[PDB]
Design an enzyme around this catalytic site. Structure first.
Site, PDB file in Angstrom:
ATOM      1  CG  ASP B  25       1.284   2.022   5.959  1.00 26.14           C
ATOM      2  OD1 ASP B  25       0.851   2.420   4.659  1.00 26.14           O
ATOM      3  OD2 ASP B  25       1.697   1.267   6.312  1.00 26.14           O
ATOM      4  CB  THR B  26      -1.623   5.682   1.520  1.00 27.96           C
ATOM      5  OG1 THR B  26      -0.890   4.562   0.197  1.00 27.96           O
ATOM      6  CG2 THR B  26      -1.591   7.225   1.388  1.00 27.96           C
ATOM      7  N   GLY B  27      -1.484   2.783   2.391  1.00 27.39           N
ATOM      8  CA  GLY B  27      -2.226   0.597   2.417  1.00 27.39           C
ATOM      9  C   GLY B  27      -1.315   0.838   3.648  1.00 27.39           C
TER      10      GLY B  27
HETATM   11  C1  NEJ Z   1       7.130  -1.587   7.375  1.00 32.50           C
HETATM   12  C2  NEJ Z   1       6.084  -0.489   6.989  1.00 32.50           C
HETATM   13  C3  NEJ Z   1       4.614  -1.031   6.273  1.00 32.50           C
HETATM   14  C4  NEJ Z   1       3.649  -2.053   7.567  1.00 32.50           C
HETATM   15  C5  NEJ Z   1       4.733  -2.052   5.699  1.00 32.50           C
HETATM   16  N1  NEJ Z   1       3.479  -2.799   4.642  1.00 32.50           N
HETATM   17  C6  NEJ Z   1       2.951  -1.543   3.506  1.00 32.50           C
HETATM   18  C7  NEJ Z   1       1.350  -1.115   4.528  1.00 32.50           C
HETATM   19  O1  NEJ Z   1       1.142  -0.516   3.971  1.00 32.50           O
HETATM   20  C8  NEJ Z   1       0.831  -2.651   4.601  1.00 32.50           C
HETATM   21  C9  NEJ Z   1       0.380  -3.381   2.809  1.00 32.50           C
HETATM   22  C10 NEJ Z   1      -0.209  -4.145   3.548  1.00 32.50           C
HETATM   23  C11 NEJ Z   1      -0.195  -5.250   3.395  1.00 32.50           C
HETATM   24  C12 NEJ Z   1      -1.128  -6.682   3.979  1.00 32.50           C
HETATM   25  C13 NEJ Z   1      -2.389  -6.473   3.833  1.00 32.50           C
HETATM   26  C14 NEJ Z   1      -3.297  -5.043   3.332  1.00 32.50           C
HETATM   27  C15 NEJ Z   1      -2.189  -4.026   3.214  1.00 32.50           C
HETATM   28  N2  NEJ Z   1      -0.238  -2.076   4.965  1.00 32.50           N
HETATM   29  C16 NEJ Z   1      -0.753  -3.223   6.346  1.00 32.50           C
HETATM   30  O2  NEJ Z   1      -0.478  -3.381   6.922  1.00 32.50           O
HETATM   31  O3  NEJ Z   1      -1.573  -2.699   7.027  1.00 32.50           O
HETATM   32  C17 NEJ Z   1      -2.265  -3.143   8.101  1.00 32.50           C
HETATM   33  C18 NEJ Z   1      -2.449  -1.745   9.486  1.00 32.50           C
HETATM   34  O4  NEJ Z   1      -3.641  -1.077   8.448  1.00 32.50           O
HETATM   35  C19 NEJ Z   1      -4.543  -2.895   7.834  1.00 32.50           C
HETATM   36  O5  NEJ Z   1      -4.829  -2.687   6.610  1.00 32.50           O
HETATM   37  C20 NEJ Z   1      -4.029  -3.358   5.975  1.00 32.50           C
HETATM   38  C21 NEJ Z   1      -3.222  -4.002   6.331  1.00 32.50           C
HETATM   39  C22 NEJ Z   1      -3.701  -3.801   8.241  1.00 32.50           C
HETATM   40  S1  NEJ Z   1       3.575  -3.769   3.479  1.00 32.50           S
HETATM   41  O6  NEJ Z   1       3.193  -4.400   3.162  1.00 32.50           O
HETATM   42  O7  NEJ Z   1       4.557  -5.035   5.506  1.00 32.50           O
HETATM   43  C23 NEJ Z   1       5.702  -4.105   3.051  1.00 32.50           C
HETATM   44  C24 NEJ Z   1       7.405  -4.306   3.516  1.00 32.50           C
HETATM   45  C25 NEJ Z   1       8.365  -4.841   2.867  1.00 32.50           C
HETATM   46  C26 NEJ Z   1       8.336  -4.030   1.925  1.00 32.50           C
HETATM   47  C27 NEJ Z   1       8.943  -4.027   0.623  1.00 32.50           C
HETATM   48  C28 NEJ Z   1      10.865  -4.495   0.867  1.00 32.50           C
HETATM   49  O8  NEJ Z   1       9.695  -2.252   0.422  1.00 32.50           O
HETATM   50  C29 NEJ Z   1       6.766  -4.340   1.153  1.00 32.50           C
HETATM   51  C30 NEJ Z   1       5.202  -3.935   1.949  1.00 32.50           C
END
Ligand code: NEJ
Lengths: 99, 99
Positions: B25-27
């Protein structure tokens, strides 16, 4: 190019005639962008992650350019804290993970 | 390996002697795993995602092997929707984005 992950992989995108910064996010199935008033029809959707769900508007066949690479596909618009480029578009620009 | 993104980048990890499946999960800044038993001390922490903030247990300096590559770092444990491997460990296994 090659992007290391010491910091967030933020890049400039172009969508709806606007430039914005967005994450290249292999953890997102779909693309989610900050509230913006795009034209055309949309469908309501709820998407969930850490902390719970947010309500978004689903737009289809939207043109988007990610660091010079063109793509077209679904974008979800809503109160996300960060612009998220998901796999639906990362595939179209030829993006891979490598280690 | 080189990992394309037409499917979720799910890999097998080993942590605390047990195998699990996790999403590259690069995000994600941080690595967050679903509720599990881990030895050693932990600290209560807060983390925010797309839908708000959750309480997690922070485990520091934890051995974790990801797709055959060893890492030692911080692992957060709590009510995440799925096991995610974040940049704090992706950097350790030498993961980059390429397009
Ligand atoms: C299910 C697997 C993941 C959780 C899914 N997400 C991607 C994930 O990369 C998020 C992106 C993010 C979100 C908010 C703030 C920064 C970055 N990062 C994240 O939560 O990171 C946490 C832990 O590390 C910290 O750093 C950043 C936050 C902390 S999601 O955004 O919720 C999502 C759900 C559904 C869909 C559609 C349906 O496809 C698209 C995207």
């Amino acid at each position: 190019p090659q992007i290391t992950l010491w910091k967030r992989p933020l890049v400039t995108i172009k969508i709806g005639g606007q430039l914005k910064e967005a994450l290249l996010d292999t953890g997102a199935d779909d693309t989610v962008l900050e509230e913006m008033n795009l034209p055309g029809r949309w469908k309501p959707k709820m998407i969930g992650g850490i902390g719970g769900f947010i309500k978004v508007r689903q737009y289809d066949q939207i043109l988007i350019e990610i660091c010079g690479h063109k793509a077209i596909g679904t974008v979800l618009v809503g109160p996300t804290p960060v612009n998220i480029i998901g796999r639906n578009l990362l595939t179209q620009i030829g993006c891979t993970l490598n280690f």
